[PDB]
Structure formats: C-alpha cells, structure tokens
Symmetry: D3
C-alpha cells in the first residue's frame, strides 16, 4: 500500500537523502538531539501510525550515541503503532571481535549478539545491512535480515576505473579474507593471491596490478603493510577496495604515507570529511542497493520482484 | 563465599568505597574504547559461579557507560556467573521530557528501553537509588531495589543545620511535593511548595531547605532559591540525591544565593567541587554496600536492611 | 470496515454510549458465572479477522470482571481476530498501598501483575483513562493510551461554576500536587494543597475545587473539604475521574459539606446517584470513542485526536 | 533447609494439615480484601532465598482465590524467594463445558489462560491433584505434579465397604471409563458404565454394591441420575466417590433426596460446612500425599526419594 | 489473493487433493536429504507477503518429516511470508506410552516438545485432524483447529453398512468411550465396550454388525483381539473404523489374519502401498475437510463464514 | 556432587570414554524407536537436582538423533534437574549450502533452528567441538563452549609425521585459510591454498610433506581432488586431518582410491565401522577435551580451573 516513511539518524544523512531520492520520497520529520546531560533526545515529527517505517542509521561516528538514537527511534515508532519498523544499518556496529583466541576454544560474539538483542527488544521487525563482517550475524536475530553485498558495485568500478583489470590480481590482506577475494577473482576471471603475517605472500603478483580487497578498514595498519609487501613483490600499482571505510586514528595518515594508487570505499559511512584530508579516497555510491532492498521489503509492487534483476 | 564487585568507568570512587565497606577488592577488568569508538570490555578474572555485582552509574558520557555496563552484564552471564546484579546509583533516562501532551500521556520509552536492554543483557537484579519515579521498579520482571537517600539526608540536616528544628522543607516544583512533605513530616517541620513564579506556604524568617531528587541544569532550583530569598528566608539550602550539574549549572549555583548545595556520591563530584565552593557530598556507599550484602544473603535469611544503623 | 465493540459485565452503559458514538451495535456475547463461581464467556458472533475492542472497567467485583476480560481477550485472539484492544476506563490495582518502609520503595506488584495478565491473555493494545500513575503505561510492551478527563473537567468547570474565573484548585494530599497545578494553569487560577490537617495556600472567600484522580472511601476528600470550610472558602467542590465510592463513601459525602461531587462515567454511578444527590457525572464516551476511532485508523494517517470537539 | 509454607484463604484446614505433617508452622501472611474488592496480600516474614510453597485450592470464590494466589506467587518471586511452588489441590477451570462445534473441538482457554497466569506470576512448580485431564500438565513449561487420589480411595473402599470384593465400579458418564476401569482392575472386580441421551447401563449391577467414581461433583445432577438408574438395575446400595467435592447450586439438596449410602470426597476442598447440611458426605484426607510431593520437590532427604514407597 | 499451498514429502496425494479442492497448484519446493542425512529444503518461488500453508503429515519417517516441516515453516517466516500455517493431518507424538504410574501421572513431554518446536519455527496457526487428546490444542499459543472425521465416518457407515440401523459401535478399550457413544448417539444406535484388564465385553452385540471405532491404529493388537472377542460374542460381522491408519510393524499381518469385513481409515496418512498388501483397507478421503478449513483460516470469502454449513 | 553423564544412541564410544575420564558410569537410560518411528526415551534413574550432561553427536541418522537429544533434554528439565547440558561433539546442520545469491547472502535457517530447538527443549549450556562457523555460538542465549581439536592435532602431527618440521599445511578451499595458517604458525611451517573455479594451488609444496587440514569431511570430493593436485605439484606424501569424519556416500570409495598416506579424524563421530572398510582412517581420541570441559562447567573443583593448563 501507499504508506512508506524513511527517517534518518544523525549517523549519515547524505545517504539517507540519496535513498529517499531513489525512492521518490522526502525524509520523515524527526528531531534528534542530545540533552545537556548526554541523554539522547528523539522526537518523531509526524504520525507513523500504520506506516511502513525504515530508519537509516549507520553504525559509524560516535557509535554508542548513534546506536542509542536508533533504539529509541525504533521503539518510539513501535509504540506509536507503526505497521512495521525496519532498521537500515549499512555498517553493522560491533561486528568485529579482536580476540586472544582461547587457543583451546573460541570466544563468543557477545557484543554483536548484544547489539542484535537490543535491536530486537527495541522492536525492529526487519534489518537491512551491508557486508556483515560475518554473515552468520544474520542468525543472531529471529526477524529477517538482508545482508546485501557491495561486490557488484566493486566489480563494476574495477572494470570501469582500472585499465589493466583484465590482467590483474586480487589480494587479500589477511587469512580470513580469502573467500571474498576468490569470489571477486572468479567473477573477473583474474588471478588471486593472499598475504599472511614478518609478512609472507602466497601467489603470483609480479608485474601486474594488485587489488587488496577486504570488508573494512579501520586503523589501516594491515592494508598498508600489505601494500608495501605487494610493492616488494614487483606489483605495478596497488589498489585498496573496502566496503566499510571506518578510518580511525592514524588511518588517514597511514594511507597518505602508503603507496596506494587509490583507496575505494562505499558510502555506507560518511567520507566527505575524510576525503578533504585524503586525496586517494574514492567512494562507490551504494544508495541504490539499499533503496532496492527497502523497496522489496515493502512489497508494494509485485511479489515476484527479484532483486537481482534491477540494473546497477 | 562467592561475591565479586566490579566497576565500570563511570564511577570508580564509589565502587572502591563500596568494596571497602565489604572488605573486598574490585575485580580485575579492562574497560576502554577502541579507536573506532566501540566499547571494549575484558573481564580479567574468573566469575564462574560467582555472585557478581557491577557498579555503574548513569552520569558521564551516559551512552558509553550504559553500553559498557550491558556488555559487562552479558559477558558475566555467558561466563556462567551464578548471578549478575546491576548496581546503578543514578538510573539513566528516567526523566520524561514531553510538552505535557494534553488529552493523553507520553510513555516512558527511554526508561523502559534502558530496562529492556538491561534485562536482555542478562541482569538478574538491579540495585539503584531514588528512581525519578518509583514505578520504574515495575518496568522489570527481575527484582529492583530502589534505595532512598532520605535517612542520610535526614541525618545530614540534623547534624549541619543548627536551626533544623524550626526550618521548612520547600519543593522546587509541583511534582516534588511528596518527597518534601515526607521529609518535613520525618523532621516534624513545615513544608511549602513553589510553582511557575509563585510560592505557596510561609517561609519568611526561617531556614528554607529545597529538596528534589536530582539537579541537572539547575534553572528551576536557582529560580526557586531566588524566590525563597525574596520571601524572607534566613538561608536557603538545596539538597538533591543526584547531582548531574550539566551545562551552566555550576555557573548558575555560584551566582545563586544557596548557603549550600548538598548531593550524594551517586555521581562523581570531586571535579565539580573544585569549581563550586558550595557543593558538599553525602556519602551513600554504605547504603549501597548494605543492599549488596542483603541481596547476597550470606549471613541470615532475616537480616534486615533497616536494622543496620547508619 | 472490521470494527467490533463488546461489553463486559462491568459497565454496560458506557459500552453502549461508545458504540452509539461510532454508529455501531454492541457485539453479541454471553457473560455469566457458573454455579461454582467460574466465569463463563461465549462470543456469540464471529470475530475472525476483526479489530475487536472489549470495554471493561475495573469496578464491582474487580476480580470477576478482570477474569471475564482476560477470557474474552484470549478467546478473541484464539478466534483469529486481527487485533484485540482492552478498553479499561478505570485500571484495577493501580494504587499502591504500601506501608512505606522508608529505606526503599515497594514495587507495583499488583499493578504489574494485571498488566502481565492482560499481555499474556493476548491484548494488543490498552485504552484507559487517567492511570493512577502514568508510568503504568510502561508496564506493557504493547501501546497503552492513557487518556485524560482534564479537557472534559475544564469544560465542566467553565460551564457550571460561575466564579470559575477566580476560585482556587486544591489537592487533597501531597501526591496530587501536579494534577491540581495542571488544572489551575489551564484555568489561569490559584492553587493550594492540603496535607495530613494543614493547608498551604489561599482559599479565602473564593470557591475551592478539590481535584484528585479517584475517590474510594472518601475519608481524605471529606476531611479536606472540612478544612476548606474552616479556611473560609465560599463553596467546596470535589472533582474525580474515578468514582469508586466504596464502604462509607456515600454516607460520608452526604454528611460532608460538598456543593457537588463530580465524577466521570468510567465507573457506573446510577445506583449511587440514587443514594447521593451531590453526584453529577461527566460523560467521557467521546474521548474513549475517539481513541477507538483513532486506534482503528479507518479515516487517515493524520487523524489527530486533539482536533475533534 | 529452607522451606516455607503459606496458606491462602482458599483452604486453611488443609494447609495446616500439610504443615502438621511436615513439622512446620505456616508462614505469616495477611490475606484480605480492600473496600473496593481489590485483593490485599502482605507477606508477614522474609522469603529471601527460601523454597516457598503456597497452598491455594481452586474452590470458594474462585476468582478472588486465584488472584490472591497470583499476587502471593509474584510477591514471593520479587522478594527474591529461591523457588515458588503453587500447591493447587483442585485446579480451577479444568472442565470446559462447550458444545464441540460439530466438526471440531473447542480449545481449552480458561485452563490454559489459568496456566499462563500462574506462569507469568512467577510460579516455578505446580502440585495439583487429579486434573480433569492430565494434559493440563502440558499447558505449563515448568514441572507439574498431578497426584492421584486413587490409593486413598482404594484403601477407603477396602476398609469401609464390606461387600467390596463383589462390588461393581460404575462411571456416571462416557469420559470416566478409564478412571473406573483402573480401580476395578486394582480391586479385581467388575465395572460398568452409564451413558445418558434417558439413561443406558452397560455391565452387570444386579445384587451387587455399585460404586460411582468420578473426578468431581459440581451440581451433582449426573451422579444422582446414575444412582437412580443403578437402583433400577438391582444394585443393593450405591456409593459415590469423587476426588473434588465442589457441591455448588442444588448439590446438597440433590444428595439428601438421592438413594446414596454415602458420598465420599477428598479434602482438596473444605467440607465441614457442607457436611453440616448433608450427613452423607464423608471425607478422606489427602494431606500426606501433598506433603510428600512437597518434600520431594524440596529435595531434602535424598535424590532417590521415591514418592511411591511412602506408606499411606 | 495471496495463498500458497506447499507440500512436504510426507504425503503428496493429500497435498494434491487439497490443492485441487481449492483450485490451486502446489507451490514449487525441493525437499530432499543430503548424503549425510541432513534435511535439505529450498523454496522454488516467492512467498513474500503470502499466506502460506504447508501440508506435512506425521506418518512416514516421523523425525525426518518433522524436521522437513520445521525447516520449511522457518524458511517461509524468514522469507517474510504474511502468515505460515502447518497442516498436520496426523499429529506426531500425540500418544503417551505411560506406565501411568501410581500416585501421579507422567507429562506429555513429547507432544509438548513437538508443539514448542512448531511454535519456535514460526508457525502462526495449526490445522490438524482428530488429535489423540483434544488438549493438545492448548500446548500452543497460536490457534489450533482440531477437526473431526466423525461426519465423514458417519457418512461412510450409512452408505456402506446396510444393517447400520441395528448395529453396535464398539470401543476397543477404556477411554474410547466418548468417541463410540458420540457416534452411537449420532446414528441412534447401541454401544458396547471392550476392556483388557482376558478380554471382557459390556454391552450387547449378539446378532448385529459390530463396528470398532478408535482414533488410530498402530500395531493393531488391541483391535484384532477385540475383533475376535466380538466374533466369539456372536456379532454378525465386524468392522474397524479408525481416523489415522499408521499400520506399522505386524499390523498388516494381524489384519489379514483377523476376521474384519473392512478396516476403514482416512487419507491423513498414505495408504496406497499398504492397500497393495492388505485388501480389507478402505479409505475415506478427508481432503475436503482440510481444504475447507484452509479456506476458512485464509478468510478470503467472508467474515460470516462458518464451515459447519458446507456439504461434504 | 551432582554429576550424571547420560549417553545418547548416536555414539556411545565417546560417551563411555568421557564418563571413564571422569570416573563415572553412564546413567541408565532407554533410548529406542517405536514400531511407528516415534522416538522413545525413558530416564532409568533420578536426576532431581543433578547436573546432567547428555552426549549426542550430529552423526548417523541426524534427525532421529536430534529428536532423541531434544526429548532427553526436555525429560531431564521437567524432572527438576538442576542443570542440563547438551554435549554435541559434531553440531548438526551447521554447514551452509547456499550457492550464494549475487547481491546478498542466505541466512542460516537450519542451524539456528537447531539452536532454537535446543533452547526451547530446555538446554542450559552447550559443549561442542570445532563448530563449522564459530558464530553459531551466538545463536544461543545459554553459554556455548566451542572447543578446538587443534592442540590434539598439533600433538598428532609432531608425533606421527617425522619430516613435520619442513611440511606444508594446505587448505582444500578458500574458506579454510585461517584454519591452516593458525596451524602453520603453531608449527613454524609453510602454508598453501587450493582453489576451484580446473584447480589452482597457491603457495609451494614441492618436495615437502603436504597436510590437508579442514574442519570436516563429508563426501570428500574436494580433499581428494586436492590430494591429486598436491601430487601433481610434487608433494612427498599427502595427509588429511579433519576434525569431523562424516564420510557419507562415495567418501570411502573416494578415499581408498585417493593417494593419502593417512586421513586423520577425531572421535566426535564413530569411526570403527568406517575404519573396517577404509585402512587410511586413523582416529585422534578427543575424549579428554570434552571431559575436561564438562569438569569445568560443573565447577566442582574451583573457580580458577583453567582449561588452558590441563595437558592432553
Ligand atoms: O447438573 P448436571 O451438569 O446435569 O450434572 C451435574 C454435573 O455437572 C458438572 O459437570 C459435574 O460433573 C456434575 O456431575
Ligand atoms: O561433495 P563435493 O562437492 O564432491 O565435495 C565438497 C566437500 O564436502 C565435504 O566438506 C567433503 O569433505 C568434501 O571435500
């Protein structure tokens, strides 16, 4: 039916607008502030009674304030008798678990499940997200989660922006990133190689373009060395492509000092501020991927809508 | 023999005071934030089978402290702690804002959300002090102890206000009526109430004590104190259990006519006392320590919290 | 086009008034007790796929009416109703009668229990009026509408108390301060409040209106009215949303000095108005009917309940 | 070593009887009603860390007693009781008069709702006797103990009816067949069954003592008509033995005008007042059976405490 | 206009018969087992926003079928179906193999477990036929329909047993009393009962056709011994009518050797294979009852619908 | 002093080995299937107030075993067991067969379903070994211990492969990269990776012993093609060490035909039968890891038991 409303957090508003543009809608009116004493203030500026509500709130920026803002907004819509509340969380907070593997066993994803449980008790009915650090986070909920992939937009950018892409190779910065890399190399019909930590390279990278692909970049320590090792192995030029560009701490300083031809991230986190101080950052717009998932969750057009059919 | 106390980053000083009163050292925990702002918690010691009490207040950067508390509770619960208790001296998000919607009331969304998050994190029990509304106790299905600072406030009044026997308990707004009427009856004294500004009750030529549950920006308590000065009150005091003091509060109090502003230690005050000569704190760590004692139930089924002399 | 209203045994006059305001007949239901005291409920019509509103107040034998309500809600939910809303004008069990225990405070056991039973029975939504404490709204996870009689009380004051422009709004105890301060601000009048008995404020030679959310045994409101007479108030009124009037209340009011005791229809008053002449009732069916109209959402997304008179 | 027993207003002679047998005095509780008929409960002593048993029957003013029970259970849980067990000798709402909408069956709601209330109040364990249908045990997620009166009835038969070795056991309706056949097999006697629709008897009753056995007697229309039919078939004398003696409405008048030698019930429901107006009612005491189930629930003496070994 | 019927692997003919009666084709679904015995289910079409009914019986390899049912129910729920109904003609685990115990009764552990798994998988509604005990309805919090085969059995008796007006409806054991008295009352005929303790008969069967009626037949030892006893007591011809024909173990061998004129079952479990080795089996098709219940649950036609009125 | 280890039918060798290591006999339990395929469970001794551990693996007919585990857990829970732990060496349904959609991922319905059933049956704690994905730990709210066979594998390598100091740890696919580099880092040896698309190997294994390491082997098609590829690359001898030996379908025929010097599995699944038809299977006993985890869960020894410190 005709009852969709999009709201934005303070997390990232440019994207919230881009999605609404792609769907032909204006953003719902909402007051999101902080009181003097640090308490999150939310005021929904319009009736959501009977509406299909989508709240866009990345999990970047001051993460706990943004998370609290998201939970209050979701819960407020649910008690104002909204028909459905979907959290559109492009970058899911707390996905990563640096450990100290209790070598006899493994640690559990406390914080990712906590975040999931809070979304559930707040009253979220459905989650739309992008490239969960681990896809199993999908099973931390009982509500449907759509874990969308940036690979098609990356794959695109690669063919259109790297000339010798036909002859290149994709490298993984770490051990765990193999699947992703192998997926992209298989889709492109190119070679793959992987780096592991002193740091070692497995695979042929000599005299061909190397593309480091990973899910996110926070501190950037790892991709930077990886770029050094790829240069030492005789790669012509090195690129870095990450879906989530967190870039905290010394990250910006590291990339400018590193040998990257370009660092490509999607728009799931705001980059406008970071591009001002870093020339090698380029962004892939993923507003259509998200807009298309909201359009399909809404189910207003055809039941047999297939997500996979819409062009990019 | 299985009691463990842990502190968050919110308020270490009380956490130490409580552990002292119980003859315990604080459990080892690394509580920080990563580069990307995510709260990091690591329990540095075993809690398997232990009765764990986490002390965290809701002052400071409240959302970082709250998230840290939830991760600690949950982490303790999946580490097979026998019981996890959240000790939250000042409960965050308890005060509803609203424009007093007419025709109907707003709901305590954020206060219920905090309760819901504490429950799913795995809190088995909450110990707190002077909830903004006592009904917040009923937002949980686990037991909540809503402790009162009143006995310590009562003792402080008798010990520090020479003329306390002939004074008058003033409420800063219409809402705090039951608290001030409660204290005046306990002291066998008069009460008055202020509402925006008008004063109801006689306060001229007697010591006036403003009582409220908490003071944030302090605009209401300072205008009320002004009205009490213009109405001929000898000296005006402000007694609040929770001293948040955000924004211009310190500047407003120093410019205002208070003889003293008394708060408890439920929120850290050392920093604010360096910038305010008139803040005094009532230590309430024993009340909290005695409630923790009582939840643990290590001595007898029949220990009564009220039998312990302050 | 799927609304249905049903009545409990508790108050059927209001249930009819509400149904009238919505152009509806009450749904067919048999509500009795068996020989052995067990509540019998039989939904006499189909509720499959419908937006069901059960109107039941908590008065009379609260426990029989409450159990009856819970069985009706659950039966409708298991009969595959689209939505079941409990319309509870006077919420049972809200007042706390804790002997105080100063160290700390007792918890709303019975009020939380009632909320939990309504939820587990299968209530999707609560409509109620002037909850003893508005925080009871948060004892649920489903939406609760806590409606106010204040607008109807304001209107009644302006139309029936000639001197309302001057006057003064008195609270019977410390707890009702915020409620009386609310009405006085809406009316641009003075307030005072009574405690223990002591009076704080200025009754003078002005009309004093005692305002509180409910009157049970009426010991407090009648002593407050006496104190208001000793302070020289021209005439004393009592205005309460919930007129329970149990025990000696009716007898106490007749002996008291009230010019009138005004209550709303959230609880049935016909029997008690026969034994008390001072009781007048404010009809609130339009507030409840408008919350039901708004819950159903048949008109539009933006129907604002505050725009209707 | 921490067991506390509280009685409700439901039945106190029984709760005292249980307490005598365990060696305990009943815990202090104020259990009354306010002027507005709201139920008032106050726990007169600490239950912190205690294993609490609340005895409340499903008789009397059922909704008052039920609400009272729920408030006490909830109150003990929020006072940090270790465990709260509801001892409900006669489970309210078990029987459901309906009229199976030919083609289907009605569902048990009031018995399931009653179970759900016990659960949401905070009950950890139920002890009950002779549930109208044993499946009510599955209406809970907490353990339910459905004790049987059969052993006390078998004793009573062997010690109070002389010709018991050649007596017939008769079901007053079709639904009670299993219960009566079980007693006939234990006694090594014959049974017969009555069905109304005008009454029909299958089975031989001529010149033998007939014992009508059912789980409950309410209005007693059915057992009285069965008594007439049994005399019509030549039975020497007729007894009726029910577990729950509710006896509402015209029950006492019906039994005083019927041809019963005796009506035997348990004290799951108080009988002193009804016995004053009906010389035929006799009660068999079931306190020990309940006391023994509470002892086992508590688990004081041993892990391998077998409820089936204790003498009666 | 959003209704899909899907079939399990358990009984497809009924799934087809039901889909036919509603004018529908079965939804596309791949239901297999992997090499390693894990149940594989993959939904071949969109169910987003659709009213889904999964028909799976509790016949066959009960645990494999139960897992298949649970995975497709859950799969539909995470694919954002509006509602998912489990149509379970023969409810698994509904019969308790108690030793009854003395003193107390065991609990319906397995039947409640099945109920809890159906609920947690995401079932919104259950349609079933002749639950072994009607109380299983209360093991759920979602609606459950227990539908009866009695009207179809009543039709079959009148249409196929000519001397039906002077027959006897016999229960093979205690407990099946209410079922046989219900049918005897509908036909205005006599009833009798069999009990094992040596088998005993109460009621008259001499010179009249005896119809043994029960809810289900597993190993068939009781019904066959009962058939001998009905013959030795001088019944003209003996029939057996059961709603659920499981016929496991020696059942077929017992029936072929027994004196039954016919054993009549419904189609809730597939019989074609068993009819190939047993000639006395006749089947009553009940697809119209289940389909009509699916129609009424869907609520396509009218709120005032009531399936008591549909012909059969 | 409350430990009871009970065994399922799925693998009792381990159940005995675990109980032996703890100085205990297995609890008495009857675990069978009825004629009609329904799972029968009867607890042969009291568990009231006891700490119960039920050992069942996801091997064999997985759905029958899972149903048996769930019924035992429930039976113990309704018998007022103090705590019930599921010890599930090989977690069923943990592997995803999605054939990933290109824009988003599939949810883990089955695994979570299994998790949800364990939870709703009443499991208080899960002990498992080398979960296919460690995130399954977060599918529960009860604690899950995901134990590693790595230390035991590390022992076996040093003890049985003499040139182990110069060997390579090879991953059969992209997913196991992180698993093999962890082992190579522990041994201070080289790693390599195999990938399909024709099969590629990145890294170097020539003239060195190659050890294929993976979490489980089902049908064994990948590890056997990988072993052939390792032979084409000049590996001295090829080993396979997987935690979980399912070996269904052609696995045994494939392994016997393959060039493996040895295929090493742990005892999480019974191997005696498969070893009779395959001479290259060797088993690592991991019974001490599970027993020590049960010891630590019981908490009978101290608060500091450190799983880390006990030697295997
Ligand atoms: O008065 P009637 O119901 O006809 O017969 C009385 C029965 O009603 C109740 O169900 C009890 O079982 C009584 O035996
Ligand atoms: O079944 P295939 O596709 O032939 O082989 C893939 C793998 O399936 C299991 O992990 C086996 O260990 C195999 O190596």
């Amino acid at each position: 039916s005709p009852n969709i409303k999009i709201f934005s957090g303070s997390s990232h508003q440019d994207l919230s607008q881009k999605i609404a543009d792609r769907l032909g809608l204006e953003l719902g009116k909402v007051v999101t502030k902080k009181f003097s004493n640090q308490e999150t203030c939310v005021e929904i500026g319009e009736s959501v009674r009977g509406e299909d509500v989508y709240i866009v709130q990345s999990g970047c920026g001051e993460i706990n304030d943004n998370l609290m803002e998201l939970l209050i907004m979701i819960n407020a819509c649910k008690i104002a008798s909204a028909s459905r509340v979907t959290a559109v969380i492009p970058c899911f907070p707390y996905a990563r678990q640096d450990k100290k593997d209790k070598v006899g066993e493994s640690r559990a994803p406390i914080s990712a499940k906590l975040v999931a449980n809070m979304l559930s008790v707040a009253g979220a009915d459905h989650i739309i997200t992008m490239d969960l650090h681990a896809s199993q986070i999908q099973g931390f909920f009982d509500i449907p989660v759509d874990n969308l992939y940036a690979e098609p937009a990356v794959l695109k950018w690669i063919r259109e922006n790297i000339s010798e892409w036909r002859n290149c190779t994709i490298v993984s910065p770490d051990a765990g990133g193999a699947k992703r890399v192998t997926s992209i190399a298989d889709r492109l019909n190119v070679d793959f190689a992987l780096i592991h930590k002193r740091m070692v390279l497995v695979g042929d990278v000599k005299d061909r373009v190397a593309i480091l692909v990973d899910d996110m970049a926070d501190t950037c320590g790892t991709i930077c060395h990886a770029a050094d090792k790829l240069l030492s192995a005789g790669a012509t030029r090195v690129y870095a492509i990450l879906t989530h560009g967190i870039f905290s701490g010394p990250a910006i300083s590291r990339i400018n000092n590193a040998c990257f031809e370009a660092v490509v991230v999607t728009n799931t986190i705001p980059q406008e501020d970071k591009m001002k101080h870093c020339s090698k950052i380029q962004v892939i717009d993923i507003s259509m991927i998200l807009a298309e998932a909201i359009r399909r969750t809404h189910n207003g057009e055809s039941v047999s809508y297939l997500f996979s059919h819409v062009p990019l």
